[PDB]
Structure formats: structure tokens, C-alpha cells
Enzyme design. Structure first.
Site, PDB file in Angstrom:
ATOM      1  N   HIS A   1       0.813  -1.233   0.000  1.00 11.74           N
ATOM      2  CA  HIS A   1       0.000   0.000   0.000  1.00 11.74           C
ATOM      3  C   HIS A   1       0.838   1.272   0.000  1.00 11.74           C
ATOM      4  O   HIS A   1       0.309   2.341  -0.303  1.00 11.74           O
ATOM      5  CB  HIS A   1      -0.969   0.041   1.192  1.00 11.74           C
ATOM      6  CG  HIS A   1      -1.992  -1.049   1.194  1.00 11.74           C
ATOM      7  ND1 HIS A   1      -2.891  -1.198   0.152  1.00 11.74           N
ATOM      8  CD2 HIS A   1      -2.262  -1.976   2.141  1.00 11.74           C
ATOM      9  CE1 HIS A   1      -3.632  -2.245   0.469  1.00 11.74           C
ATOM     10  NE2 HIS A   1      -3.317  -2.718   1.670  1.00 11.74           N
TER      11      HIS A   1
ATOM     12  N   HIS B   1      -4.424 -47.122 -29.456  1.00  8.68           N
ATOM     13  CA  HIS B   1      -5.247 -47.479 -30.623  1.00  8.68           C
ATOM     14  C   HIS B   1      -5.980 -48.820 -30.438  1.00  8.68           C
ATOM     15  O   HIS B   1      -6.933 -49.079 -31.169  1.00  8.68           O
ATOM     16  CB  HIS B   1      -4.430 -47.494 -31.928  1.00  8.68           C
ATOM     17  CG  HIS B   1      -3.895 -46.152 -32.325  1.00  8.68           C
ATOM     18  ND1 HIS B   1      -4.736 -45.066 -32.503  1.00  8.68           N
ATOM     19  CD2 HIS B   1      -2.624 -45.768 -32.592  1.00  8.68           C
ATOM     20  CE1 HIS B   1      -3.956 -44.069 -32.888  1.00  8.68           C
ATOM     21  NE2 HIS B   1      -2.680 -44.439 -32.953  1.00  8.68           N
TER      22      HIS B   1
HETATM   23  C1  LIG Z   1     -12.266   1.299   7.948  1.00 13.11           C
HETATM   24  C2  LIG Z   1     -11.161   0.746   7.083  1.00 13.11           C
HETATM   25  C3  LIG Z   1     -11.343  -0.741   6.771  1.00 13.11           C
HETATM   26  C4  LIG Z   1     -10.057  -1.510   6.494  1.00 13.11           C
HETATM   27  N1  LIG Z   1      -8.978  -1.238   7.461  1.00 13.11           N
HETATM   28  C5  LIG Z   1      -7.740  -0.729   6.863  1.00 13.11           C
HETATM   29  C6  LIG Z   1      -6.765  -1.785   6.392  1.00 13.11           C
HETATM   30  C7  LIG Z   1      -5.687  -1.419   5.599  1.00 13.11           C
HETATM   31  C8  LIG Z   1      -4.734  -2.342   5.214  1.00 13.11           C
HETATM   32  C9  LIG Z   1      -4.835  -3.674   5.609  1.00 13.11           C
HETATM   33  C10 LIG Z   1      -3.771  -4.639   5.196  1.00 13.11           C
HETATM   34  O1  LIG Z   1      -4.016  -5.835   5.044  1.00 13.11           O
HETATM   35  N2  LIG Z   1      -2.566  -4.117   4.987  1.00 13.11           N
HETATM   36  O2  LIG Z   1      -1.499  -4.943   4.636  1.00 13.11           O
HETATM   37  C11 LIG Z   1      -5.925  -4.052   6.394  1.00 13.11           C
HETATM   38  C12 LIG Z   1      -6.873  -3.117   6.778  1.00 13.11           C
HETATM   39  C13 LIG Z   1      -9.002  -1.382   8.824  1.00 13.11           C
HETATM   40  O3  LIG Z   1      -9.990  -1.800   9.414  1.00 13.11           O
HETATM   41  N3  LIG Z   1      -7.856  -1.015   9.461  1.00 13.11           N
HETATM   42  C14 LIG Z   1      -7.616  -0.932  10.858  1.00 13.11           C
HETATM   43  C15 LIG Z   1      -6.899   0.161  11.342  1.00 13.11           C
HETATM   44  C16 LIG Z   1      -6.579   0.236  12.690  1.00 13.11           C
HETATM   45  C17 LIG Z   1      -6.973  -0.767  13.561  1.00 13.11           C
HETATM   46  C18 LIG Z   1      -7.691  -1.850  13.082  1.00 13.11           C
HETATM   47  C19 LIG Z   1      -8.016  -1.937  11.738  1.00 13.11           C
HETATM   48  C1  LIG Z   2      -2.051 -45.427 -44.323  1.00 12.63           C
HETATM   49  C2  LIG Z   2      -1.727 -45.340 -42.848  1.00 12.63           C
HETATM   50  C3  LIG Z   2      -1.101 -43.998 -42.470  1.00 12.63           C
HETATM   51  C4  LIG Z   2      -0.552 -43.933 -41.050  1.00 12.63           C
HETATM   52  N1  LIG Z   2       0.506 -44.922 -40.777  1.00 12.63           N
HETATM   53  C5  LIG Z   2       0.163 -45.939 -39.779  1.00 12.63           C
HETATM   54  C6  LIG Z   2       0.315 -45.482 -38.345  1.00 12.63           C
HETATM   55  C7  LIG Z   2      -0.430 -46.079 -37.336  1.00 12.63           C
HETATM   56  C8  LIG Z   2      -0.245 -45.728 -36.010  1.00 12.63           C
HETATM   57  C9  LIG Z   2       0.708 -44.778 -35.653  1.00 12.63           C
HETATM   58  C10 LIG Z   2       1.086 -44.608 -34.219  1.00 12.63           C
HETATM   59  O1  LIG Z   2       1.689 -43.609 -33.826  1.00 12.63           O
HETATM   60  N2  LIG Z   2       0.770 -45.631 -33.433  1.00 12.63           N
HETATM   61  O2  LIG Z   2       1.168 -45.642 -32.098  1.00 12.63           O
HETATM   62  C11 LIG Z   2       1.422 -44.142 -36.666  1.00 12.63           C
HETATM   63  C12 LIG Z   2       1.233 -44.496 -37.990  1.00 12.63           C
HETATM   64  C13 LIG Z   2       1.774 -44.916 -41.290  1.00 12.63           C
HETATM   65  O3  LIG Z   2       2.182 -43.986 -41.972  1.00 12.63           O
HETATM   66  N3  LIG Z   2       2.561 -45.967 -40.933  1.00 12.63           N
HETATM   67  C14 LIG Z   2       3.880 -46.249 -41.373  1.00 12.63           C
HETATM   68  C15 LIG Z   2       4.233 -47.581 -41.583  1.00 12.63           C
HETATM   69  C16 LIG Z   2       5.512 -47.900 -42.014  1.00 12.63           C
HETATM   70  C17 LIG Z   2       6.442 -46.900 -42.246  1.00 12.63           C
HETATM   71  C18 LIG Z   2       6.096 -45.575 -42.034  1.00 12.63           C
HETATM   72  C19 LIG Z   2       4.822 -45.245 -41.598  1.00 12.63           C
HETATM   73 ZN   LIG Z   3      -4.325  -7.001   3.022  1.00 14.08          ZN
HETATM   74 ZN   LIG Z   4       0.803 -41.691 -32.304  1.00 13.56          ZN
END
Ligand SMILES: CCCCN(Cc1ccc(C(=O)NO)cc1)C(=O)Nc1ccccc1
Ligand SMILES: CCCCN(Cc1ccc(C(=O)NO)cc1)C(=O)Nc1ccccc1
Ligand SMILES: [Zn+2]
Ligand SMILES: [Zn+2]
Ligand SMILES: [Cl-]
Ligand SMILES: [K+]
Ligand SMILES: [K+]
Ligand SMILES: [K+]
Ligand SMILES: [K+]
Length: 722
Positions: free
Chosen positions: A136, A495
Site C-alpha cells: 500500500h 489405438h
Molecule cells: C475502515 C477501514 C477498513 C479496512 N482497514 C484498513 C486496512 C488497511 C490495510 C490492511 C492490510 O491488510 N494491509 O497490509 C488491512 C486493513 C481497517 O480496518 N484497518 C484498521 C486500522 C486500525 C486498527 C484496526 C483496523
Molecule cells: C495409411 C496409414 C497412415 C498412417 N501410418 C500408420 C500409423 C499407425 C499408427 C501410428 C502410431 O503412432 N501408433 O502408435 C502411426 C502411424 C503410417 O504412416 N505408418 C507407417 C508404416 C511404415 C512406415 C512408415 C509409416
Molecule cells: Zn491485506
Molecule cells: Zn501416435
């Protein structure tokens, strides 16, 4: 980056000032000593690196404050109680003490100490347990218990001393930090984000400039983001949605080199000042989310929080995240309320012209590997991409990057026929089983009865080892042996259908693992399956299509059905059947090469909001690396850093219970580097550098909006589209 350690700053000076004229004053020494007592009690304090405080100099105070103001504050140390009261009364909600100035100087200084440690990689992150607060405080005046603006000084300091160009300040304290807003109002180098109770200006500090319409001015226009709450009782679901749909897309576009957090805990349940219902656990999630935006360069400083216990729990939850402890179970709903959705939507519309990211809208790690899975091979084509060396190359890369020795080795085992019957027909099991004793002519004949299948006498055993290895991994996770795991397995599975083998898959490993997970816990265990392989997992979708206990989310190259497996079942309008409606999310890509921009955008606006509302107890990743840059089959450009960021996002789900299962991926270098990056994330390493996430391809924007429209009636967190 490779920085380690969590810094903590605390000095006795933080308790050496208090309100002289009101013993009931909420801003008291007990605030910080209660936090310190709980950190010690929870075993967190001993795990931190103790960082010494230092006093801020006049030159560092002058980066933000006027000389006249600094001199007036300096003089308060020699004043009488009467003089202190007269001066305090000239400002809004402030008290003074002869020790205030000295403590305020050490309070600014503690943040500068952490900034030094983090910017030089002596530490990864840090938390200052400081008082007085700062957000703050203004250039020439005290305000809301603040004398000097701790974080505003730290941001300008980071720029001057450590050559930081861009700083992100996140303020989650229940009050608007108008101090920070005013200081950087015309500054594009410091992005200020504040989420605060507003209630149309009826809540303190009662400023019209606390509204979402105050976007900054001059060169700083669009660099000031206000998220005002206009209803009390906001919960963790509301804060998390705001970070997903608004802050993270903007932060990733902004690319800060440092994240500073005005860590107030007056929004926590039980605070007398806040009126909000945020669980302390929420702060673990928020902190986790901020680790991804500046390569883990994150500094938190205590602002408000007046319920002693609530504040100490909030600090402990944030500290647990900084130390890399698994994310906790969230006790409340993952869905935002209507009032919060209204405020998030209004802020998005007010910042929409300035951010392309907003313009989309219309712990131990387990490792399983067995070289026996290399025995499955293509005897007719030795250059077929589903190569035995796919798994051996991934495993070797884990040894080269020294990841293997950091993991707990989970033994591979064979799945039984009874376990295969969880997803597959007895006819399908027996046909694949029979291939074990077939001659090459019969193996050729059998393979041709399926779409894209090659079989050897070792294929059935390899598919049993791939499934059994994942069951051992899921069991290790669900029995607490490990928190998360990686499975370097082949042949792939997504798959494979109930009654058929398809696309290099015999049995559906991911589907079987989800049913196996349910058989060892409870039938209704909530399992999330994220399938980032470039192809649609047709088999997985079909197995769980009528099921609301297993949420299936697939991202895949579709091309209006022109890409394998060439079925309209992969389109966005396929949302599931019966009680499973809304539990099948297809993100189909059209019009060529997609990469990190599109994948990150799909996770921010679709994957993560849906997953958080579903609240899984286990996350399974059908992790094919065929959408990777360099893949000969995929034609996509997801980088290894891209996959690291997707993994990092999923780790805040299911209390960190994530199992990464290898599917496709055919460029040996690409898959070795990509899967190694995913393991590095599971191990808790900082998310890597990830630039150029905007603009998205126009067709990806069309795909994302088509998905949002299909799933918005099922998932409230998607209704951020005004
Ligand atoms: C009427 C105002 C409402 C919010 N605040 C102010 C406030 C400001 C900062 C933080 C804080 O967290 N600062 O790090 C908290 C509360 C308060 O209530 N502050 C407060 C001041 C003196 C004693 C007790 C409480
Ligand atoms: C007409 C099919 C087109 C996709 N595939 C098959 C395929 C299937 C599964 C995955 C895979 O990642 N499986 O875990 C990848 C490719 C391929 O291209 N397969 C492939 C086979 C031999 C050499 C190179 C590629
Ligand atoms: Zn605070
Ligand atoms: Zn794959
Ligand atoms: Cl064949
Ligand atoms: K705030
Ligand atoms: K600004
Ligand atoms: K997929
Ligand atoms: K489903």
C-alpha cells in the site's frame, strides 16, 4: 534453470515495533512469530536455507520513494508517542513506533537479499517472513500499515542490479495494492496483477482505480491487471480459475525474468478482515503455477493476513510448494462461482486489446524399463518406425542426463490374462496369445487382419510386459512407494480396442492401468487420462465413452478425418455417451503444423480447467512423442521444453499422483530429449525457458473455441467466455 534451495528471511527486528496506542491492533509482532513457530513445527524451517536480512540503503529507497518522504520516515525514530500519533493520523490506516523505520528498512532489505540469491542461482526461490508489509506504500506517503513499498523497490532493484528487463508482480492479498499500481502505472517493464475484494468500491481502499478498467497509461497501457471480487466468500476454485484463464496466458506472453509475490493471507478462511473462504492449500497450487512462468525465479514476501493460525497455514502451504513437496488435496470444489466468472470475464474483456493470449476467446519418482520389450520387431521391414531402439534410446538419455540414479527403479512384470480381461474380450486375448507359437507366414497373415500391425513370436510377451510395468507403477503410486512415475514401454496401447489390435497397439495399456488402479482402490476412483500423442486414442475413447469415473482428454492432429486413425469419432462434438457425456474431450487440430503455442493454449483454456473441476485422484499420461519437432510421422513442432511445461501443469492435479506412459514417437533424438524433460519435471526440477507462445495459428483458435462450445454446458470453469 539448475538452481536449488529455498531461502527464508527472518530477523528478531521484525517483532521490535508495534502499535503503542492500541493493544488489539491486528498488525502485530505475533503475526511473524506464529508463522516461524508453525514452519519449525511442520519441519519446513530446517529444510530452508536461512538468508540474512540487510538494511535497504537511501539509493535503493529512492528507486521508488521521494527523498523528502525517506527523510521524514527516518526522523520518526527520534519522535515522542505524541509526535508519532500526530504524524500517523495524517495518513490512512497507519500507526508509528520508534522502531518502525529500522524494521521497515530490514523488511525491504530481506526481499533484496532473496532477489540476489535467486537472480545469481545461489537459490531457486525464497520467502521473506517480514513485517511491516509494503504493497500500500506510495512514493511520498504511508498507507494501510505500510511505510516502504517492499516489492516495488525489489522489482526496480532486480532491473538495476541484475539486468532484468521484465518483472511480474502477483498480488493475492485480499486488498488492492494501489501503491504498486501507482508506482508502475506507466511502466511496461513491470507487469502488476492484483486479485482483491472490491464490491463496486464499498471495500477498502474504496478506489475506482481498483476496478478492471484501470489497465495502466502511456507506455504502460495493458501492463496493469485488476481482478476485483464483487461478492464475499470467494473460494480456491475462483482463485485457481482466474490464474488458469487470465494470469497464466498473460504471464507466458509477458515472459518475465522474475516473479515477485505480494503474499498476503487475508483471503484465507478465518481472517476477520477478508471475508473470503480460500483454503490455505490453494496457496500451494497458486505458488506451483507461478514456478512455470520465470523458470522458477520466484520470491514471496509477506503482506497482510491477520488470523494468526490461518496466515501461518497459508505461509506453510506456499513454502511446501517452494520446497517441491507434492501438491495437496484441494478440500473444496474445482469449479468457480458465477460472481467470480463475471469478474474474470470482465477483466479479460478490459485487457483483451493488449494481449494476444486473451484474444483466443471469441517425493520420489518411479521409473520402469525392461530391455525385454525390445524383442517385439518387424521381420519384413527392419526400418519400420516402431523400432526396438525407441525404448533403449530413451533409457540411455535418462542415464546420460543422470536422471536414472535420481529415480526409484520399479520392476517390470507380465500382465495376467485376468488383468487383460479388465478391458479386452477373451477372443482378442486368445488370438494375440496364439501368435507366440506362429510361424512367419501365419504371423504375416494375422498382422494383415488388422490396420497397421506387425507381429513377431515375442509381440504378445512384450505387450504383457508394457501393461504389467504400468500396473506396478500405478500400484507403487497408489500405495505411497513413490509420488509419480515414468514407464518406458513398447508396443504402444491407445489405438487398441476391446476386441481388436490397431496402429502398432495390441492391448490398451493406459485403459488397463485406469481399470487396474480402480481394482486396487475403489471402483469409482477418479482417473484422468491425458493423451498428448499426435494421434487420437480411438481405443481409450471407446473403452470409457459411457464412463464418468475416467475423464479422457485427447489432443490430436485431425485434418477433418484425413489423419490416422481417420475417424469422425476424434471430432470435438464427440463428448461421451450417457452418464459419460462431458467426460470425453477431443481437441482436434486442423490446417498443418501446431507446436508449443497451441498446446499451451489448449492446456490453459481447456485441459487444466476441465481436469481441476473433475478433480482426479490419479493422472495417467498417454505420452506419445510423435507431435514432437523432428517426428517423421506427426509433422508437428512441440519442443522438449513444451512437454516439460505440459508435465508441470499436470503435477498440481491428483496431489501430484501422475504416471507418464510411453505411446508413439518416432524420431529417436526427439523422444529421448522430450521424455527425459518430462522425468526431470516429475523429479521437481524447475520448468525450462519457453518463449514465443503467441500468436496461435488461426485454425487452432477455431479448434479451441469449438471445444469450449461443446463442453461449456458440462464444465463451469469453461464459461469464462462471457
Ligand atoms: C475502515 C477501514 C477498513 C479496512 N482497514 C484498513 C486496512 C488497511 C490495510 C490492511 C492490510 O491488510 N494491509 O497490509 C488491512 C486493513 C481497517 O480496518 N484497518 C484498521 C486500522 C486500525 C486498527 C484496526 C483496523
Ligand atoms: C495409411 C496409414 C497412415 C498412417 N501410418 C500408420 C500409423 C499407425 C499408427 C501410428 C502410431 O503412432 N501408433 O502408435 C502411426 C502411424 C503410417 O504412416 N505408418 C507407417 C508404416 C511404415 C512406415 C512408415 C509409416
Ligand atoms: Zn491485506
Ligand atoms: Zn501416435
Ligand atoms: Cl504384417
Ligand atoms: K491483491
Ligand atoms: K505496470
Ligand atoms: K492424442
Ligand atoms: K470417459
Amino acid at each position: 534453470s539448475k538452481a536449488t534451495g529455498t531461502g527464508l528471511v527472518y530477523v528478531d527486528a521484525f517483532t521490535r515495533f508495534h502499535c503503542l496506542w492500541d493493544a488489539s491492533h491486528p498488525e502485530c509482532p505475533a503475526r511473524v512469530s506464529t508463522v516461524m513457530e508453525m514452519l519449525e513445527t511442520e519441519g519446513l524451517l530446517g529444510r530452508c536455507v536461512q538468508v540474512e536480512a540487510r538494511a535497504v540503503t537511501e539509493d535503493e529507497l529512492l528507486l521508488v520513494h521521494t527523498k523528502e518522504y525517506v527523510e521524514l520516515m527516518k526522523s520518526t525514530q527520534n519522535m515522542t508517542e505524541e509526535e508519532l500519533k500526530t504524524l500517523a493520523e495524517k495518513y490512512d490506516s497507519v500507526y508509528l513506533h520508534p522502531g518502525f523505520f529500522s524494521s521497515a528498512c530490514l523488511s525491504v532489505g530481506s526481499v533484496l537479499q532473496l532477489v540476489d540469491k535467486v537472480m545469481t542461482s545461489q537459490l531457486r526461490n525464497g520467502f521473506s517472513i517480514n513485517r511491516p508489509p509494503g504493497h500500500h506504500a506510495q512514493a511520498d506517503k504511508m498507507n494501510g500499515f505500510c511505510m516502504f513499498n517492499n516489492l516495488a523497490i525489489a522489482a526496480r532493484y532486480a532491473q538495476k542490479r541484475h539486468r532484468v528487463q521484465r518483472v511480474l508482480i502477483v498480488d493475492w492479498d485480499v486488498h488492492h495494492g494501489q501503491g504498486i499500481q501507482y508506482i508502475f502505472e506507466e511502466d511496461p517493464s513491470v507487469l502488476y496483477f492484483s486479485v482483491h475484494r472490491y464490491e463496486d468500491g464499498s471495500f477498502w481502499p474504496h478506489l475506482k482505480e481498483s476496478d478492471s478498467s484501470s489497465v495502466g497509461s502511456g507506455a504502460g497501457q495493458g501492463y496493469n491487471i485488476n481482478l476485483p471480487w464483487n461478492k464475499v466468500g470467494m473460494e480456491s476454485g475462483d482463485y485457481i480459475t482466474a490464474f488458469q484463464q487470465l494470469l497464466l496466458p498473460v504471464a507466458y506472453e509477458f515472459q518475465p525474468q522474475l516473479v515477485l509475490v505480494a503474499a498476503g493471507f487475508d483471503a484465507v478462511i478465518g481472517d476477520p478482515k477478508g471475508g473470503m473462504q480460500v483454503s490455505p492449500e490453494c496457496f500451494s497450487i497458486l505458488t506451483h503455477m507461478l514456478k512455470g512462468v520465470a523458470q522458477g525465479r520466484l520470491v514471496l514476501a509477506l503482506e497482510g493476513g491477520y488470523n494468526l493460525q490461518s496466515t501461518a497455514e497459508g505461509v506453510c502451504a506456499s513454502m511446501r510448494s517452494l520446497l517441491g513437496d507434492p501438491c495437496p488435496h484441494l478440500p473444496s470444489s474445482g469449479a468457480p462461482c458465477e460472481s467470480a466468472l463475471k469478474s474474470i470475464s470482465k477483466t479479460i474483456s478490459d485487457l483483451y486489446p493488449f494481449w494476444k493470449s486473451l484474444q483466443t476467446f471469441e517425493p520420489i519418482t518411479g521409473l520402469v524399463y525392461d530391455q525385454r520389450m525390445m524383442l517385439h520387431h518387424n521381420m519384413w521391414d527392419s526400418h519400420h518406425p516402431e523400432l526396438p531402439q525407441r525404448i533403449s534410446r530413451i533409457f540411455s538419455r535418462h542415464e546420460e542426463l543422470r536422471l536414472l540414479s535420481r529415480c526409484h527403479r520399479i520392476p517390470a512384470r507380465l500382465a495376467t490374462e485376468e488383468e487383460l480381461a479388465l478391458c479386452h474380450s477373451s477372443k482378442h486375448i486368445s488370438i494375440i496369445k496364439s501368435s507366440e507359437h506362429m510361424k512367419p507366414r501365419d504371423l504375416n497373415r494375422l498382422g494383415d487382419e488388422y490396420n497397421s500391425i506387425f507381429i513377431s513370436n515375442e509381440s504378445y510377451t512384450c505387450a504383457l510386459l508394457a501393461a504389467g510395468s504400468c500396473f506396478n507403477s500405478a500400484q507403487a503410486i497408489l500405495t505411497g512407494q513413490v509420488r509419480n512415475a515414468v514407464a518406458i514401454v513398447r508396443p504402444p496401447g491407445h489405438h487398441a480396442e476391446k476386441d481388436t489390435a490397431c496402429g502398432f497397439c495390441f492391448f490398451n495399456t493406459a485403459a488397463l492401468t485406469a481399470r487396474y488402479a480402480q481394482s486396487i482402490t475403489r471402483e469409482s476412483l477418479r482417473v484422468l487420462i491425458v493423451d498428448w500423442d499426435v494421434h487420437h486414442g480411438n481405443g481409450t475413447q471407446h473403452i470409457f465413452e459411457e464412463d464418468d469415473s475416467v475423464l479422457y482428454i485427447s489432443l490430436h492432429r485431425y485434418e477433418d478425418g484425413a489423419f490416422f486413425p481417420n475417424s469422425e469419432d476424434a471430432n470435438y462434438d464427440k463428448v461421451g455417451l450417457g452418464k459419460g457425456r462431458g467426460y470425453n474431450v477431443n481437441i482436434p487440430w486442423n490446417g498443418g503444423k501446431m507446436g508449443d503455442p497451441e498446446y499451451m493454449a489448449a492446456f490453459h483454456h481447456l485441459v487444466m480447467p476441465i481436469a481441476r473441476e473433475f478433480a482426479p485422484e490419479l493422472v495417467l499420461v498417454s505420452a506419445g512423442f510423435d507431435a514432437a519437432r523432428g517426428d517423421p510421422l506427426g509433422g508437428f513442432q512441440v519442443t522438449p521444453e513444451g512437454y516439460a511445461h505440459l508435465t508441470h501443469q499436470l503435477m498440481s492435479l491428483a496431489a501430484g499422483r501422475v504416471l507418464i506412459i510411453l505411446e508413439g514417437g518416432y524420431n529417436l533424438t526427439s523422444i529421448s530429449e522430450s521424455m527425459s524433460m518430462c522425468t526431470s519435471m516429475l523429479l521437481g526440477d524447475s520448468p525450462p525457458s519457453l518463449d514465443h507462445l503467441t500468436p496461435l495459428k488461426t485454425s487452432a483458435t477455431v479448434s479451441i473455441n469449438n471445444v469450449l462450445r461443446a463442453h461449456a454446458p458440462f464444465w463451469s470453469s469453461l464459461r469464462v467466455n462471457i
